[PDB]
Amino acid sequence: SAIERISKAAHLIDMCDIIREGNPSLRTVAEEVTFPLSDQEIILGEKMMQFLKHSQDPVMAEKMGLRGGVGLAAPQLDISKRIIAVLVPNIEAYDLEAIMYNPKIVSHSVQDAALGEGEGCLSVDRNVPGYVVRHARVTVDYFDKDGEKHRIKLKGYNSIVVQHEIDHINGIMFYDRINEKDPFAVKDGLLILE
Template sequence: MIKEILQIGNPILTTKTTKVTDINSVETKSLIKDLIDTCEKNADISAGLALPQIGVSKSICVCRRVDLEEKDPDKEIDKEELWEVLINPHLLNSSSDNSTEWEACLSIGVGKDNLWGPVERPKKITVEYTSPDGSQKQLKADGYFSHVVQHEIDHLNGILFVSYINNPANIWRLEDLNAYIESNESYPEIQ
């Protein structure tokens, strides 16, 4: 079912989630389906979604495999492969070298008022998580995909990406950012 997405200011978004213990329950399967349905509806503007964003304070998020899309842009990726479902994920390790990517969040502004900003994070990470079939897995992520995974895991810990942006001058409305990029052919310089 497509769910409504909570907006910043709702305390659920800044609350650490609880671990999921009933991996195989009907409720968990239904929550995962809701996450994917809601994500797909917003697929043109979103690369992931976490349960607190649809009002449930439990540790599940979905991340779009933007790395697979980047690697082979012409290949049609099926739904199960496109959305990586991470249950109770945590970072096993992260690189000391960082990368900066422009991020946005479905919970921070709607439509042309969706807010964007540059976020610096570890470039490479390894994540340990439970997959929907109950098995323990590890996922390596690099570059933009690494940002997507870290952004979604942050949601499970009650952290929103804007908390990493020290200077509000770096936060842009989508409409203004698009206009800037169109006339300058680059992202704005970071202040």
């Protein structure tokens, strides 16, 4: 069991725990978690966040052969649960740090946005150029490990990152939102971030 081994106290998540394109799990819609959460579901959230921090540490990422990341979704660990972790650094130490259970976008702006540099994915071993078109702004509802409900409004990079992870729990990949015809086309109402 993926969640079983990953939740072991001694286990440290690394690239070998992350599945890549081709694995059906990434195109499957993750199942919602029920409350109260099991101890394993809470630990998994914590393990995920620990992974993000490790991936962001120079020495850690190096020793563990980790690809840097600011977000991670359970499906990427072959665990089909609606659980995601986000850790966006400020340029406190973080612009956004959260472990979200059953996250859901309850409202979004008409205006769209996309990173000028485009996007990458820990489960995708290749570069796919293009603007990943997303909602500029979103209001997201989610539950924390204690089952408490949170409603937040995101913009800029945080908005992009959370949408990328929520897409994972819905079986969607970043390149699914890039314009096939013109990967770098700038449509009306599209806000390029940079």
